[PDB]
Each structure stands twice: as structure tokens, then as C-alpha cells.
Amino acid sequence: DFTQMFYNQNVKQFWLPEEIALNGDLLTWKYLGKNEQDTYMKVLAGLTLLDTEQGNTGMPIVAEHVDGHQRKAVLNFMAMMENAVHAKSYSNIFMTLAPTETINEVFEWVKQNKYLQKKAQMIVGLYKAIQKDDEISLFKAMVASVYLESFLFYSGFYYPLYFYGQGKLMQSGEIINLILRDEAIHGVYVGLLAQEIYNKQTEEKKAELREFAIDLLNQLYENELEYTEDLYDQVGLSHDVKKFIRYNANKALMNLGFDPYFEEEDINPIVLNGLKATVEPLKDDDFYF
Amino acid sequence: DFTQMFYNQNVKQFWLPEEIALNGDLLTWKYLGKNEQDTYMKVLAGLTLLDTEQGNTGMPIVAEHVDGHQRKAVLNFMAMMENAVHAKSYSNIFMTLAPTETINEVFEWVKQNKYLQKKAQMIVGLYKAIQKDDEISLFKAMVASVYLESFLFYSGFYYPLYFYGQGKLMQSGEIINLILRDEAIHGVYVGLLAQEIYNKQTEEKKAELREFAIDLLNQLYENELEYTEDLYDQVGLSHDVKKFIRYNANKALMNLGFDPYFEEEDINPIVLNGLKATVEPLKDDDFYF
Amino acid sequence: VPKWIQLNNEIMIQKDGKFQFDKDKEAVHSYFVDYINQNTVFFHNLKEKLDYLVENQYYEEEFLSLYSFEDIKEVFKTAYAKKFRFPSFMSAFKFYNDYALKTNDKKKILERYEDRISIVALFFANGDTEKAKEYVNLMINQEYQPSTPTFLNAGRKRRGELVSCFLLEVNDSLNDISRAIDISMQLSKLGGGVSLNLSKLRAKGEAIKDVENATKGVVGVMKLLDNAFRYADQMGQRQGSGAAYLNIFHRDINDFLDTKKISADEDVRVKTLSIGVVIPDKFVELAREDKAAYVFYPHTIYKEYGQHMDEMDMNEMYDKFVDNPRVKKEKINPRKLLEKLAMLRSESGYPYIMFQDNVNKVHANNHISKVKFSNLCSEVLQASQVSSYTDYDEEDEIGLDISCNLGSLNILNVMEHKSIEKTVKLATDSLTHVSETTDIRNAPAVRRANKAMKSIGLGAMNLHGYLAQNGIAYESPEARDFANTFFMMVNFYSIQRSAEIAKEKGETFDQYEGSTYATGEYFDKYVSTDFSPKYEKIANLFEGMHIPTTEDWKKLKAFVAEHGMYHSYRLCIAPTGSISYVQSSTASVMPIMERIEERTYGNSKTYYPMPGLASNNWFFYKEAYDMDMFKVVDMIATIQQHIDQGISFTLFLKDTMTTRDLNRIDLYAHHRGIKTIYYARTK
Amino acid sequence: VPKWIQLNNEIMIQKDGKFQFDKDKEAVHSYFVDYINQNTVFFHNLKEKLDYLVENQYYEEEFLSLYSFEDIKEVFKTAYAKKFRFPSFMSAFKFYNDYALKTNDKKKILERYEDRISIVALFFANGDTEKAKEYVNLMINQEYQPSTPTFLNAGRKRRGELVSCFLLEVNDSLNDISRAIDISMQLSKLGGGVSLNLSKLRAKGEAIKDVENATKGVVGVMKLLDNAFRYADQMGQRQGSGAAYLNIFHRDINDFLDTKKISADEDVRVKTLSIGVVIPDKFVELAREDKAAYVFYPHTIYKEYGQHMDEMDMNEMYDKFVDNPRVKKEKINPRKLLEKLAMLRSESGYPYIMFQDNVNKVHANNHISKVKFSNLCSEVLQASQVSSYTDYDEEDEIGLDISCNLGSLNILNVMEHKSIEKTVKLATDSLTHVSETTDIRNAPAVRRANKAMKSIGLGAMNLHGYLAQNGIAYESPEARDFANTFFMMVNFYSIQRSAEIAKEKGETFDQYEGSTYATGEYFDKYVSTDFSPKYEKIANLFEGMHIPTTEDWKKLKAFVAEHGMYHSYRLCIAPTGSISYVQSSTASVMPIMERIEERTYGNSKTYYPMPGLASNNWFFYKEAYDMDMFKVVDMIATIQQHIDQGISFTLFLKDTMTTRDLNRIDLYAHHRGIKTIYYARTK
Numbered sequence A, B: 001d002f003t004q005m006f007y008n009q010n011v012k013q014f015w016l017p018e019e020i021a022l023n024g025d026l027l028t029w030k031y032l033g034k035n036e037q038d039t040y041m042k043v044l045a046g047l048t049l050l051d052t053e054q055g056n057t058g059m060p061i062v063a064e065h066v067d068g069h070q071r072k073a074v075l076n077f078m079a080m081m082e083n084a085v086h087a088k089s090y091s092n093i094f095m096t097l098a099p100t101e102t103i104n105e106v107f108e109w110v111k112q113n114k115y116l117q118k119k120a121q122m123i124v125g126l127y128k129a130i131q132k133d134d135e136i137s138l139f140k141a142m143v144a145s146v147y148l149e150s151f152l153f154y155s156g157f158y159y160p161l162y163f164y165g166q167g168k169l170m171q172s173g174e175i176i177n178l179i180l181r182d183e184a185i186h187g188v189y190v191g192l193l194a195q196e197i198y199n200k201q202t203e204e205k206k207a208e209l210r211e212f213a214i215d216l217l218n219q220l221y222e223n224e225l226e227y228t229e230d231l232y233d234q235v236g237l238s239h240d241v242k243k244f245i246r247y248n249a250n251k252a253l254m255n256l257g258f259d260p261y262f263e264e265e266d267i268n269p270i271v272l273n274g275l276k277a278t279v280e281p282l283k284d285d286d287f288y289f
Numbered sequence C, D: 001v002p003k004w005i006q007l008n009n010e011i012m013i014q015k016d017g018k019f020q021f022d023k024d025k026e027a028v029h030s031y032f033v034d035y036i037n038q039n040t041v042f043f044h045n046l047k048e049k050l051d052y053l054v055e056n057q058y059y060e061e062e063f064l065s066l067y068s069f070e071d072i073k074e075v076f077k078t079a080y081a082k083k084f085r086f087p088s089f090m091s092a093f094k095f096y097n098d099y100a101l102k103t104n105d106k107k108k109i110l111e112r113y114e115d116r117i118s119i120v121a122l123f124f125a126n127g128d129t130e131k132a133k134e135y136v137n138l139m140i141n142q143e144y145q146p147s148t149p150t151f152l153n154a155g156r157k158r159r160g161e162l163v164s165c166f167l168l169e170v171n172d173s174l175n176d177i178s179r180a181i182d183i184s185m186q187l188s189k190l191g192g193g194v195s196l197n198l199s200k201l202r203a204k205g206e207a208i209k210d211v212e213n214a215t216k217g218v219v220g221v222m223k224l225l226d227n228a229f230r231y232a233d234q235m236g237q238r239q240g241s242g243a244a245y246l247n248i249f250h251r252d253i254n255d256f257l258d259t260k261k262i263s264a265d266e267d268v269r270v271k272t273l274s275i276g277v278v279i280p281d282k283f284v285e286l287a288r289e290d291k292a293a294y295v296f297y298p299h300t301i302y303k304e305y306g307q308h309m310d311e312m313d314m315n316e317m318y319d320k321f322v323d324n325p326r327v328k329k330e331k332i333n334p335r336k337l338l339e340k341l342a343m344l345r346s347e348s349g350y351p352y353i354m355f356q357d358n359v360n361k362v363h364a365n366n367h368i369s370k371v372k373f374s375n376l377c378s379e380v381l382q383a384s385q386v387s388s389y390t391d392y393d394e395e396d397e398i399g400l401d402i403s404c405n406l407g408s409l410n411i412l413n414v415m416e417h418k419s420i421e422k423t424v425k426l427a428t429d430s431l432t433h434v435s436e437t438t439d440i441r442n443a444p445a446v447r448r449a450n451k452a453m454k455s456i457g458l459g460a461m462n463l464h465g466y467l468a469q470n471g472i473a474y475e476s477p478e479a480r481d482f483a484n485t486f487f488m489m490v491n492f493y494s495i496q497r498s499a500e501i502a503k504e505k506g507e508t509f510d511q512y513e514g515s516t517y518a519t520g521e522y523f524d525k526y527v528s529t530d531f532s533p534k535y536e537k538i539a540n541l542f543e544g545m546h547i548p549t550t551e552d553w554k555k556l557k558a559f560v561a562e563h564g565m566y567h568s569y570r571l572c573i574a575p576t577g578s579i580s581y582v583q584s585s586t587a588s589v590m591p592i593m594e595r596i597e598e599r600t601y602g603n604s605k606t607y608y609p610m611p612g613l614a615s616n617n618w619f620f621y622k623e624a625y626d627m628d629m630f631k632v633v634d635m636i637a638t639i640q641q642h643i644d645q646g647i648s649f650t651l652f653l654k655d656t657m658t659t660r661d662l663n664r665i666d667l668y669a670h671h672r673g674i675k676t677i678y679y680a681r682t683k
């Protein structure tokens, strides 16, 4: 009921890194404090590292196990955007803002970081556990994918959106907004594929899959809180970032056809500013009664 | 030395079938004989099948086994083109020119056609035989992919090109030329990757790989002859198409770094004939004269 | 999650193999005690509340000044003397979310149910304290429910119009089309649904003053009207809703229907414009015999005969049109057109079907005009005259555009109170008052027809609720027997009240003397046939209530002949969408779609069992989709014979039903005398 | 292939390295002797021809009845005595395909060039035989060309209006929006192009009677107008053309501009509606200083000050609006808005740019009103007063809606005949007659302003043709010197004719006494500055023709002060699209786009060399894209200082230049006194 519509929306959102000139960001970058520059670098590396997993494994593995030519095509298109567009865009932002040696060090740090690794490996673990012709394992991986696309990225997206909403780092913020817009539709689409599997299950199996999804969400959420304090306490933003994580967790759940887990909260206004039954002929004697 | 330039070429060649309006072919299509329309539908259906498998299976699987994020980005982009752009374009052509029943019948015909099933069996079999960290199985699949890109498509491409060259079906022909332009660069790129693996081998191993490549080519060739006769005898063109596929077989071998195998022949000259404003910010001095 | 929302959600939790229907009383009690009593603005005395409401631009001082404050206090006493309790959570929720008066910031609640009813009654009485108390008793007992416009807006300073259904005739001219667009936007601005008759507009490819093949047809006007309704979106509150009607013999009928196809081009498709098709008996006769039919270009007919094609009787004029060489036409297949209609109704629920000759064979005002089209809800069937809007300097020729005032009897509450006569007469008085107090300054034909015709619509609701709570199946012959008797009584007392109003005011409606009421032809079936119940169970339902007899109908006929009739039209059964929840009633005379209604409001899902649903009457609340549509047609035709206007008749279809089944339902409705068909709802 | 188009295609066959320009003479000769004389209906005498045309509803009897047939015969002899021959195939082809009268079946040809000219002259003279002969001499010499509506419809029975440019002011009400839609459809039905000012309309998110965020903004009215113009398309042969204008300080300016973006959605984009932006000097000053500009909500300004925003001086009230807390304003970047304007003009050619303070610093009738918007062709610049269309029962306050009759002098033929004075005066008389005989009975404000203002537009064409055929480069200072002298003389004689008409008829235009003509301030630069040519080459071009001096201008100023002026506006330079072929002239005062113009008509390809193009003047016919737009701005500003209304100024851009270059051209045009910029045409 939905793949051709998503095909259309995906292909009409096509874009390339070269379209946004990045050099003019140096005019606001130079005015940020060390903690602001440090947080931005770390957040950016976090997003880059997670998105690479999605391009190399997450999207291609789902495309491999999903049946249907049109679904495979949409999924291929999404994988292309991760590898050919998003990955180049993140690299471009980095190369503009930091010298080569600084980029290498930030990636070394974020690669060793406990909270980034915990979530990255949890997601990758579920992708590696998909078994041929087993729709339960596929569903679990789709849940992981939706959580990455619609939830885990957002502790990171917060900061570029926060600057973007203030008139700072506008070129890279525009790029991030385009990336985020792609991840949103990726999350919704994979969510619909997961609901299709979920709806084929018994009531007991459904309850079991719901428990899986909520348990996974809880593990990721508790790690996100730690990840958030680790990055954002030094710039005083953690309270507001936490509200943004919960709001996006609720969107991820709704993508999977589940009820929101967290109470509704308002979001930081600066970040908001950044953001045919059957034809049958009449055969006579139907006019007589 | 080459991936970056292929990346740039692939992304700059990006297109969608909807860019080309097809209603202009309606009259030249109406005017073709029943034999001509039948061959044309079947030819494009055979192409659709090849691109379906190249997009679903061939390109993603090669992407999985090739090392390097940039090489993977190129291969992922090529995969997307196969199933999200190329395979879909044929349906755009079908939906314009043919009634639903004729479309349904031709897709049923691909499923039961023995030559089309044999060529798919052979090519996809090699893709699915790739073993992780086994460069020889990968080479064999890359040879199969080059043969699909640079040889097997051409029994199909002949007919749209033959019409384009006579000023007939020129909108459909424009789509086909764009597809052909893509496959030419896809065949070169995969050919270069295959040569990388071949060049790592002992002379004895190389001799075996040439045997594999030539045996496979001959087996595919013999099947393609029967396919060509089956499609083209009713339009009187089988001998001409055979010359064309031999010509392109030599190009496939060359893409693999091998000498031409078939002698040169004269190809139908008809088929040979078938082949915003920049935004600049306002300065302060622009307001004074 | 609110406590009342949790309690309402425990209905679906099955305890001892049964739904917990008693949880909805707990749900509504919790809703009130925890939210409504907290958010209800309270004043020390009623005088302070009234002063605050008038001075803060909430009420109108004009209607309240007609009473001394003692009379208003006694009216409010009468409203609160009943100690009315909402039986279900959804009733109170719907009232306090749609009709209760809120502060300008929509934060607190000024009006309770009793306050709203008292204000509506005081507005209805227009200075009479006893009449206001009678209206209070009628509405707090929930025997009569004024329509959503009247109930919501009566006695409010910042109110929309009390009428929300308008029917406009569009003449074949650019001046008239522009005026139709203007009037449609003005009426949609007031919040009313607008129905437009497009049958007079000449078809596509017609001549405009010697320039042949220059007219875009009815579809260009359809696009203009769709954009006009989209623009006039009721101040961005509720989407502008309009309807377009075309005769099936109009040349543009296929283009008219193609605007609702899912594959329709964006330069053809209309989004906010409902479509209704008017079908004369000639089309059904042509389709029955499979003879190839002709659709006609209206301007050729107008040029040849000096009369519009829809102004003439197609039964006598069809052969003359076909044999006239100066009348342009194209061949169509009427059976293929019927199948296209059924396919469109299956796909989208459109068009509405109006059987022209079913309406006009019992129409009482054919001398004024034939009924050519219906409203947006397919129940208003009145005579209309097209207006001739001339150039700016010239004087316009104002016709009659239909607009009637809606009210609904609660069949369950009227039947339990044994007050058919009193409720019908008081509802007639209130509808008459609403008609007199309505003045629309930008629709001259609507205003003229409101002043002249004085037409009202008195509907009924809770038919299925009353039947299921009395152990009667909706499709049973006893249900049709009750409908026959009840609506005969309603018609009798509405005619009696209209004649009494005519006697009191000494005036009838304009051109009454030519009506069938004046000649007595209306009363023939009533002075010849007895409409008392034929079943002992049904006759017991009317115990303690005098059922009018043949002699009573003869006396009424003599009274109407002597004194006249005040209302050209009195009864029309509207869908009664949202007021049914407040009244704890099933919508209109239609059967229930679902036994328990599952809806989501905000982020919380709500459950609404049908009023009176329990274990004993569970299977009498048969869902409409499970029903035989032939028996529903039989019921509506039984009711339709006592309703002077039409009835909003929704078809409830299963997914397994084919195009042939929908066509069979439509043809049986035509055979049984059904005037209009509203919607094709598929499960 | 036709013989004449085969001969016409031999122009491009280069013989001896040169284009065969003489083939077009053979092409037109063959065209006539093989198509036109064959397809021309010929009558025994002119009496039979005129009787046939009057009887069969081709002509109007009323205007032909003011002359005895001997006088009509004399007029026709005067037309045929010239023995006019079309110099090119395109001239005759365009005339006999667009303006020549044809039989009712479009089969044969009834009117030759002389017949059409004689009929137009007899229509202009209104009973005067000598005046009719003078008009015949004027048009057969091709010194003056009436506009396409007048030339096409003068003396025809089944005709449209003689005026095709209309400007409407829309008030901030639903009644006024409905009336604007109606009037737009009425005027588009007549064949005219309609421009609407949307600045008085309140922005998106404004209140409609104390309910906030209710107004859909100017884009909803834009969609309404776009569909109204799509509906009124006159068979679709020439689809309805409309223009919308918005002040740059309107809050909806960004949404107004987003309707023309290529990526615009179908629910926003307008297709048949051109857009123009009115830019006060305040906006240019704000962008120049890189300060933060503010767009305003018009309804807040109207509520706070009692006047519409566009009726107030922004250069004096912008700071008051910003400082006013009760005025609602939105922060914008003026330089970003300018860049968006440049990008939109590069990608679509829209919006039209009106420099409001450039128009109004020289506007002669600011007492009546300031010019707030231009027409669809972006050259009509007249004072307008908005109407107040009230409810149906109430009387409407009719304002002043702009409309002027167009007519072009042929600069080449006027200069060859040394007849600037006589041509200007006769053209003024003809335009006055067209104004007097126009009566729009469905646009009250257009009718009132036509009766009161008596505005005419007398333009010119063949400026580049005359300069190139006289060895003068368009960008050269000598060309601007000639334009200065020529258009000063045209202004002098138009003012003289207007004063003489006022003296003869004893009446001036309404509110003339407050105009700058009455106060004498209009003539300051004419009584102080001499406009005689500064170059000896240009001075010889005017030899034999008296050039008014400062003394002559003082005498004319005294004459105007003592007798008044009949026309509020007299001169406007329109694009003159298709009549330029018939007159064998370059379009308007703009430079040529192509030296040899290649067109495809049906399945035939034909080429049109520029009038007088040869090898001796090949490089003087420089294409508009190859020349500096700064020098073209200089030329248009030199002409504009003698034109009371505007000039349709198209910008000819290369692909290489960025949006910064377009913005620089716009800012230089604003600096140089350019009133309006029409199109951004890119090659």
C-alpha cells in the first residue's frame, strides 16, 4: 500500500554535498568557545560513525532479507543515500572545520568512547543476528534500524540544530537538516516494513515482540542519558537534550505502530527554529422486483 | 587511482525516467507491425529481468565483498541505478505504450522463457557463490557482472537503438541511451576491479581464470544466439543482432583486460546512428553608482 | 492517561464474558468530578454570570432583555430542576468539547448543559416565560434537539448563522456564475454547507454568443466553486464544504462524474466539492430496457424552447429533445452510466443519487417549481427558482434559493414521554422562530425564499436505539410498522401546528394556494388509508397516546383548507452527526454502524457503546453493514411516505458487495419511492 | 511547401557571403499573388461590399451611418491611393492572419490593409470626412498604429473591447474579493488583461472578526484569481491573462514570490497569473545599508492608523510602523529579498519590479492618489482609488480603476515624414475617441475612472529600427540624445493637444486643479532645461521640424494653466507585440532580440529579418542580449523622463551573468529613475 509513494518521496528528496558551500561557516566557527567546538566535533563524529554502520550493514542487510522488487529498490536507494551522500557530507563538514590531525584525534576518541560504542554495537549486533527466512529476527533488526534512524541520531542532531536556530554554522546546519530529513523518511519506511511482520504474528508473539521493543528502547534510552551528560554538561544543555531524546523516542515508537512511552514535553524553541470492490454488469431482471 | 573519478561520473549522470515525457512515442508505436511490437516488448522485458537481478543481487553482493568506503559508495550507487532507475524505466515505457493485459503477458513470458531463465540462473548462481575473503569467487562473479553489463544487455539494446536511428520511438530511445551510457561505465568499473584480483595471481592461476572467463563467455554466447533467434526471426533481424552481440562481447573482454575473441564485422549503420542562474551575493558597492 | 479515559477504556476489558458497560457511568462521573467541575467558571449568583456573559461579548443583550431577570432565573431553575445526568462519557465529552461555551482563550467553561439549554430556550421563546420553560422541559428531557448551528450559536454574540444548509440555483451566465461563487463564499463564511445546481449551465463545447465550442462546461465552474470553498474555510476553523448537483441527462454528466475518480487529473479533480446526480424516471426506464440514451446540451434546449432543460419534464420532453434536430445530443449507454455511478460510489461514496420523479410525484409545491436538486446532506428537497443576476448597473431578478432550519426529535425520549404532539408542535414553533430570526445579507435569493416559503426541517433520531431498547429488530416488519405510525403522527402534528401558526398570524407561505395542501390532494392517502399499527406489540408502544385516525386526518384537511399552511416544508431527516452523542441517541433514522464506537481524541483512544447497549439487547443492535440493505430501503421508504422533504439515506455496504449489488440497491430504492441516496459506506 | 515560404527561406541561404534579404520582397509578392488575391472576396463596388459586411453582422451600422457613401468612398480612395505594399512577408502574413477580417467560417478574406485602415479611420473620425482622411493618411503612411484591440475591433459588430489593459484595486474584504474575481472574469471575457493590487489584503495569519490566524493571505486570493482567469479564457485561443501586484513591505511577500518558484506545490503555485512587486525607496535604502527590514501585517496598520499600508508613505511611516507595538511586523533581510527577486527573475522572469518612488516623484496626479501598482504589461502607471463593494442590499462606494487606450507612433515613419506634431495630435484625438466610446458595464470603477480621468496611452515603436537604419548604435550617446529630443517633442505636442481638447470641450479631467499641470510644477524642467539635440548628427535628423524651446514650453505652460488638460495621463510605451510586424517596426523602444527572427507557424518555418536589415547596417542592429544593460537602462531612463506613465522595460540577460548582475541592473535602473522593469529575458 505504500512502497511506490515512498519511492516518489525518496527520489524527489535527492541531493548532493556540493550544492551547499561550506566555507562561510568559518565566520561563526571561530567565535565559538573550546567546549562548544569540542562538543560539536564529538557529536559530528558520533553521527558519522553511526551512519556508516547504517550504510555498510543496516540498509543493505534489510534490503537483502525483505521480499519484493519495489521494496528492494527503495531500500537500495536509501543505502545509496547513506554511503554516497550522507557519508561524503559528514566528511566535507569535518574537513572544513578542523585540520586533518584534529579530525583523526576526535575519531580516535569517539571510537574509544564507552557510550557511543555501547549503542553502536547493540544496533550492529541485531543486524548480525538476522537469519535467512526468519521474519522474527528480521523484525528485531528493523526495530533496531528504526531506533537508529528516528531516535539515536537525535542526541547528536540537537547541537547542529541548536546552532542553526541561532544563525550559527548555517551551511553545515543546512546539510544536517537535509540528512535528518532523509533519516526521518528512512525510519518511517522501515517502520512500516516492521509493522507488516508484526501484523502477521499471533497475539502471544505480538506481546513478546512488544516486550522486545520496549526492553531495547529502555537499554538504549538509559545509555543515551549517559551519552548526553558526557557531551552536553560542558555546554549546559543536557536537560533540554533529554527532552528532545524522549520526544524522538516517541516518534520512533509511533513509526513501529506502538504507543508513545514518554509523556509529552515542549522542545527548546531554538532547536525548533532550526527544525474498487468488483465491477459487475447489470444483467437485467435487476430493474424488476 | 580511479574510484573518485567514477564516483563523480556516476553521480553526475543521475537521472529519472519521469524527466522524459513518453506520450510522443504513441504514434510511431501504434504504426509498428504486431511482430515488431511483440519483439520490442519482449526485448525490454528481458532487459528488465537482468536489471532486476543486477540491482537486487549483483551490485549489492559485490559491494559487500569489495573493501573501501569509496569503492562501496560507487557500487551502492550503481546498484540503486539498476533497480530504482533502470528496471523501473521499462515499466514507464510499458505503461505508456501497452495495455495492462499485454504488460501482464510479457512478465509471464519472462518467467517461462528458457533462455532468459538459463542466463539468470548462470549469472545469479555466480553472484551467490561468492565466499567472504575468497578473491577467486569474487573475480568469477565480477566476470559474470561485466558479461551482464557489456555483453548480455546488447541483444536487448539493439532494437530500441535500431528504431532511434530511424527516427522512431525516440523518447523510449532516449531512456535506453541513458541506461546504455550508465552500463558502459558500470562495465568498465567492475572490469577494473576484476583486473585487480586477476593481477594478484600466479601465471598458472591466471591461465585458469582466462579459461573460466572464455568458457563462461562461450556458454552465455551460445544461449544468447538461441534467445536472439527466438526474438528476432519474426522481424528479420537475427543475423544483424548476432553481429552486434559479438561486437559487444569483445568490449566485455576488453573491460576485463583480455584480447578480443570474435572477428570484426560491419554493424547496421542505423544502430550506429542510434548511438538555475548562479546565485552571487550582493556587495555593498553594488548599491552605489 | 486521565482517570475517566482509563475508566472508559475498561468497557472493552471483558469481565465474566461480558463488556463492562457500567464503567461508562463511572467514566462520565469521573470526567465531570475531575475535569468539568474544576474547569467550570462559577459565579455567586445567576445575575453575576449573566452580566459577565453579556458584558464580555459572549451573549446577546437583545434576547435576554426580553425577560425580567426573575423569569430568566425561573427558566434556569427549570433547567436545573431536572438534575440531568449524562449517561455516557462520550455525551458529556462531545457537549463540553463542541457546544459548551468556553472563554475567549478556550481555557475554562462558562456554560453547563443546563445553561446552554436555558439560553437556547430563552432565545426560542422570544419574551414568553412559559414558552421558555416549555422549551427547557422539552430539551432537558432531550425530546427535541435543535440542530448543531441552532444549539451551538443561539444567544451568542460571536455566533455563526443558525442555518447551515443552503441550496443555490446557478443560471447559465458569467454574471450568475460569479454571483454564485460570491454567495457560496459568503455562506461558507457563515459556516453553512452550500449546494449548487449546475444543470442550467451549458455543457463543454457550447457556443458563447456566436463563438462555438467556447464553454468549459460545468467542470470549470466546479473548479471555481472548489477553490471558492477552499478559500472560504470558515476562518480556518472547519473546512469549507460544498455540493454540486447535475442532472443525469446533462451532457457533462460523465465529466461531472470523472471529477471524483481516484485517477482524476489535477486540472479536473475537485477535492472539497461533493457531487450529487439527479436521475429522472426516464433514465431508469431507458436503462431498464437497455435502450441507448442521449445526454443533451442545455443551451440548445434553452434556445429551441425558451426553457431550461432541467425546468422541463424529461418524461414528456425526452422524445421531443431527441427528435429535434436543433437540440444537440450525444448517445450514451444508460446501463454503463449506472455501472459507472455504482463504481464511483464504491470507490469514493459519491455521487449522491436524487431520484427526481420520486421527489416530485409527492412534492406539494410543484406549482412553485419542481425539486431539481438536494443539499449537501441529501435530505432537503424543496422548490427553487433560479435568479437572473444581471450587470452591475441593472436590476437583478431574485429567485428562490432553498435554506431550511433543522431540528431533531429524539424518538426514544418522545416515545417514553408519550409526547409526540407536544414535542412536534414545540419543535415546529422553535424552527419557525429560527426561520424568522434568520436574515442573510449577501444571498438575496436565500433571504427571499426564507421570508416567503418559511420552510423548516423537523427530523428524527434514535430510531434504532428506540427499537433495539424495545426488543425490535430494525429490519423487522414491526420496526417498519412503528416507523409508519410514529412518522404519520409526526406529520399530522406538524401539519396541525403549521395550520395553527397560519391561523394565528393570518398568513400562509407564498404561493400556498397552488399547493396540494390547498387543493386537498396531499391528504388523500391520509383520509383514505389508516396508519395505525398493525402489530399488537407496536400498538402497545403507543399506549396512552392518541394515534390520528382517518377522521382526524379529514378534520386536519378541513382545518388546512380553512386556515392555510404556514410552512411550505416541515419535515426533513438530516444525518444529525454530532448532536446524537449529546442526546445519547443513534444518528438519524439510520441503523448503527458499530455496536461500540472506537475513536481517538488527542493521544487517548475512547470507546462509545451505542446508547442503551447491554447484554439483553446486544443482538437487536445489529450493525448496519450486517443488515440487508433492501430492508433498510423498506424502512426508509416507510418513513419517507410521511416526510415532505427527503431523508439522508446512507448505504452501508460490505467489501464483498459488487457494482451490481450497489446498482440493485439503488434501483430498489428507486422502485420503493426513495427520494435521495446519501452515501455508499463500505466496510 | 508554399511558394512564398519557400522564397522566404532563401533569405538564410547565404549567396556570396551575404543573406539574401531581397527574397522577402519576392516572398511577400508571391504570398499575395498566390494566396491573398485568391482568397480575397472582391465585390463589384464598395457599396456592395459595405452592404454585405453590415448585413451579415461583420460591421457596425451606427458608425458607418454618420457618413454619406460618397464620403466613405473618398476615404477608401484615400487609403488605396497610397498603394501601400508590405515590405516583408511577415508583415502581410501577420496582418492577414491576426487583424484582417475573415468570413464567418474563417475561409476567405474580406478586408485588405486599406479596408481595415479606412474602417478604423471612419470609426475614429466619428462623422468627419476630412478627419477620416487625415487618419487614413496617418495609418497608411504607418506613422501611427492603433493598439491590437482597437485596430482589430474598430467598427466590427461581434468584437471585444478596444481597451485590453485594466488595473483593479482590491479592498480587504470578502465582498471586495468576490467583486474582484467577478470583474476579472468579466474583463478577461472582453479580452483584456487584468492587473490586481493585492497590497490592501491582509496577510496570512490575520484575524477575521476577532478570530486569529484565520486569513489565508494573498496567496488564497491569488489562487482564486488564477482559476478565475483560467475559466475566462475566450475559447482558450488567448487564455485569460492576469497580473497580481504586492508591495514589498507586505508580510505575504515571500509567499507571494514563492508562487512562481519551479519547486512550488500545486496548492500554492499560480500559472496564469503574472506577479509584480512594488518596491518603495525605503526598501532599497534598507538593503543598501544592510539593515534589518520589516514586512508588516496590513490589517494591523489599518486598525491602528485607519489607512491601508499602501495608501501611506513608507519612507515616512516605516519607522512609525516599526516602533508601533500595535502594528504586527515580521523581520526580513532586505538583501536576501533582493537576491530572491533576482533569482526568481532569472528562473522565471517574474516578478515585475515597480520602483514606487520613481513613479511617484514625477507623478502628476498624486493629489488623486499615488501609483501603487502597474498593469500586466508593467507600463501603465496611474492613480487609483480602491472601491468599497458592500453587501447586496447596500450601496457600493465606487473608486477609480485604471484603464487606458494604447497607440504607438512609428518613430521611423514619423521622422521620415517630419510629422511629430501632426501624428501626435491625431493619435491623441483617436485615443480620446476610443476612451469616449468605451463603456464597461460590468466594471463600475473602470467605467468611472474612464469617464473621469480620460487617460490615454500614446507609445512609440521602431526606435531601434530607426537608429540602426540611420547608423546610430542603440547604446551610443547619440541614440539617447535623439530619444531625449524626440520624446520631449512628443510630450510637448501631446500636452498641447490635451490642452486644446480641454479648451474645445470646455472640460478637464477630474481633479485636474490639484495636478502638477495646474500648479505648473510639471513644466519646471521644460521651462528651465533645453532639450535640443546636443549632437550635429542628431540635429540634422530633426531638420525641417521645429523643436520646442524653453520659450515654447513656457507658452505651453501658460496655455495649460489657462485652459487645463483633458487627459490625466497621455503617454505610455507598451510592448506593442504583434502590431510591430504589421508596421514593419522593432517592438517598442526596446532593442531587438534577434537580427533575423526564426519562427514556426503550424508545420511551416519562416524567417523575419529586422526591418531595414542589410549589410550596411548589420552591426547597428545589435541584439539586445549582446549589449550592456546599463546603457539600455540609460536609454529607457532618458525616454522615461518625457513619459508620464511607465515603459515596458524588458531586461535581456545572458546565461553567464549571475543573480548579482541582475540585481545590479535593477539597482542601476532604480538609481536612474526607471519606473518599472517588465521582464528578465535570458538567452
Ligand SMILES: Cc1cn([C@H]2C[C@H](O)[C@@H](COP(=O)(O)OP(=O)(O)OP(=O)(O)O)O2)c(=O)[nH]c1=O
Pocket (backbone or CB within 6 Å): C189, C231, C232, C233, C234, C235, D171, D172, D173, D174, D175, D177, D201, D202, D207, D208, D209, D210, D214, D215, D216, D217, D220
Ligand atoms: C471570510 C474570509 C475572509 N478572509 C480574509 C480576506 C479579507 O481580505 C479579510 C477580510 O474579510 P471580511 O469580509 O472583511 O470579514 P469581516 O468584515 O467579517 O472581518 P473584519 O471585521 O476583520 O473586517 O479576511 C479569508 O481569508 N477567508 C475567509 O473565509
Ligand SMILES: Nc1nc2c(ncn2[C@H]2C[C@H](O)[C@@H](COP(=O)(O)OP(=O)(O)O)O2)c(=O)[nH]1
Pocket (backbone or CB within 6 Å): C041, C042, C043, C044, C045, C046, C047, C049, C073, C076, C077, C078, C080, C115
Ligand atoms: N449561582 C449560580 N447559579 C447558576 C450559575 N449558572 C447557572 N446557574 C443557575 C442555578 C440556578 O438554577 C439558577 C439561580 O442561581 P442563583 O442565582 O444562585 O439562585 P438562588 O438559589 O440564590 O435563588 O441559576 C452560576 O454560575 N452560579
Ligand SMILES: Nc1nc2c(ncn2[C@H]2C[C@H](O)[C@@H](COP(=O)(O)OP(=O)(O)O)O2)c(=O)[nH]1
Pocket (backbone or CB within 6 Å): D041, D042, D043, D044, D045, D046, D047, D049, D073, D076, D077, D078, D080, D081, D115
Ligand atoms: N470595387 C471595390 N472597391 C473596393 C473593395 N474594397 C475596397 N474597395 C475600394 C477601392 C476604391 O478605392 C474604392 C471604390 O471602389 P469602387 O466602389 O469599385 O469604385 P470606382 O472604382 O467605380 O470609383 O473602394 C471591393 O471589394 N470592391
Ligand SMILES: [Mg+2]
Pocket (backbone or CB within 6 Å): C172, C173, C174
Ligand atoms: Mg447569457
Ligand SMILES: [Mg+2]
Pocket (backbone or CB within 6 Å): D172, D173, D174
Ligand atoms: Mg471587512
Ligand SMILES: [Mn+2]
Pocket (backbone or CB within 6 Å): A051, A054, A081, A082, A086, A179, A183
Ligand atoms: Mn544517513
Ligand SMILES: [Mn+2]
Pocket (backbone or CB within 6 Å): A054, A082, A149, A182, A183, A186
Ligand atoms: Mn538513514
Ligand SMILES: [Mn+2]
Pocket (backbone or CB within 6 Å): B051, B054, B081, B082, B086, B087, B179, B182, B183
Ligand atoms: Mn542497468
Ligand SMILES: [Mn+2]
Pocket (backbone or CB within 6 Å): B054, B078, B082, B149, B182, B183, B186, B187
Ligand atoms: Mn549496470
